[PDB]
Amino acid sequence: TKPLDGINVLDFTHVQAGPACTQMMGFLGANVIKIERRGSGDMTRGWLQDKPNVDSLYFTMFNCNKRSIELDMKTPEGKELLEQMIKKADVMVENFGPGALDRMGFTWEYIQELNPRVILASVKGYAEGHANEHLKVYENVAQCSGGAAATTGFWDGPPTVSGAALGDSNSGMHLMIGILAALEMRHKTGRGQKVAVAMQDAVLNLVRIKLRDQQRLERTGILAEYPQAQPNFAFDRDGNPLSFDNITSVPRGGNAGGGGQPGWMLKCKGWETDADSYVYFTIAANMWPQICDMIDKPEWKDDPAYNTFEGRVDKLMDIFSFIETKFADKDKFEVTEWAAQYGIPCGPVMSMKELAHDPSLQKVGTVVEVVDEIRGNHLTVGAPFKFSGFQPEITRAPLLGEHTDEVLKELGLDDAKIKELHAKQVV
Template sequence: MTKALSGIKVLDLSRVVAGPTCTSMLGDLGADIIKVEGPELVDETRTWFPPDVEEISLYFMAVNRNKRAITVDLKTEKGIQIIKKLLKEADVVVENFKTGTMERLGLGYEELKALNPKLIHCSITGFGHTGPYKHLPGYDFIAQGMSGFMSVNGTPDGEPTKAGIAMADLYTGLYAVISILAALQARNHTGRGQHCDISLLDSMVSSLLNIGTGFLNTGNLPVRYGNQHPTLVPYQNFNTKDYEIIIAVGNDGQFERLCSLLEVDELSRDERFATASARIMNREALIPRIQEALLTKTADEWLTAFQENNIPCGPINTLDRVFEDKQVLERQMIQEVEHPQVGMVKLLGSPLKLSDTPVTIERHPPLHGEHTEEVLLELGYDSQEIESLMEEKVINMKIASSSSIPINQ
């Protein structure tokens, strides 16, 4: 089956989360992803367990499907020559080295452009390739804090809180994918590749959306609202007779219908609550009245009634409920893939639903060095040359278990 990115070859020099998230998504879309690790020093996430299956990291599996894995020592001249041969044939290279590292390896953008003018070079760093912070290391947690995201996340009387998932890494990986797809489209017109400079801090600052725009134009520092919304009321979690649900009222009509179902119609006629602006100013008086009414029925009773009356709502699910949800199952958000070392493993499905070129998982998350020989043979190396590279420790085709893999320094 021809897929959306069939015929596109991507050299993946990235590790940890943001870069591998990007390349895994490109792989989902059909690109041939060649993931490069050192013969001994590998992607750290291979060592991040538990959770694991037979000491194979599930963290690594989450962001490294649909890839082939090879080992190359970039500290050797012969290793750099292998990379250059791969780059001559590649459409895209994705890396998340510190600013300046690619230049020290002789693989900076100007060198790569001379080697392959059509190559798209996507760099993922903490702070980008310009500015006073460009040489500093960057991590998801740091980007969440420096961007201001944590200052508006959490309860009003609690501490600034990071997201429970690697939000900066995820956003950065997604923006990297977008930049690469845009560069591929531009190349169709110009015949030239380009450099995509994507950073964790930029990605998280961009995520501030209305909150950031509000501050820029008013100068007012936003406060933390916890699970409430700064400009929509009621828009938060509430207790019911058994467990919590979310109600997300977005307009006055929805509020009127909510009040009718709760049998508190007088609230929708009260000038303190009749309009969206009024509800914002008087949320402290409104929320307890709604909460009191909701305690009279179970969550399922309320959710059914609200859904039937077009009031946005939903449960606050634990993961066991998520992966039993009929909508999640219908949308194929659980995928199974055969892994050569541990058997069948379950992975998250792709949110990309394409009618003509559907996204599929063609390759399991690769073992360390699993495809080194295969890729080198494709590059034109013969068996004797590959054996020699093994002896010189430029490559390593030994498939190691995670428990024996040292962590990158």
């Protein structure tokens, strides 16, 4: 009937990690009240605007299903207003930095006093107690700190950031797990908890497979499925071989599978003119026979050299170079359809152009057209979890302070006090 219907979210967040978390809670039915500073608001509003004096797409795509109040919290009457809101809130969400909320007059300890049931949820750069606990962290800094950058890209290039928001939105989603887990605890104890997610830790969690590989490397001195282990395939700077001699930390493997199933990024017709004309092709062991049939190589079916993972690992790049010749006169989707005949794990690199206007993603509610009568409609990503008993209803992002008076009435305030709060500039 809507999972978070009746959950009151007092939302101090700004930028991406925090706002991503509360938006998604909003999509699941929560009543999200965004507290914004008087005059300015969330810095995403003015960030890379596509039209002057209109809230940016950075703002709108992270702040749907929210209401906005302006509030000067450096003010005695504003701190009092927060106290009432805190008494009515189920969860407060924040990303102010290492000691900022306490400095504002709101200790965890004081918060428990005001409401024994409220949950305090925070995003930080580094975990509390960490030596770098006070370092400031944006998106790519967190990718660097959590091991992703070191292990992404190519052996002869730099550490490389992912286009995906491994640091920001990923942290927000991990924080949503934490908040929902604290809600389940509260059903037993009747009490709220403090939950926090550090961006470094959210990234490390997705980089679990590389910590696996670091241990494998420490124990054996080799990762036989990595490109560096193939006979003279990779080269340093001066034209000579690379190898796991002298490699002590997980290296970049380009477009290697990253797991138990070898893969590579294979060019398709149009690659010279189109940056996204590629397919990813995975050799799943249980269907090497089917692969042999597609690429017309019956000799490889019965040959220990090309028919087991172990036989295969010393010449992966020759096998991928050869499969790739088969795709030179076929586009992405033709290659994909061809492979779907055999149930092969092969699919296209989808461009952002293709995804934004894909009819399937819109049918299933993953890409959603938001009706925004103030700014014009925009696309967004909806809820990536689909439920049998409920569908989200996505609603446009709030103007700065649009809901101030409406929210103040909900607390229980008169037209007298509201009009004087506007004169005193606390709202």
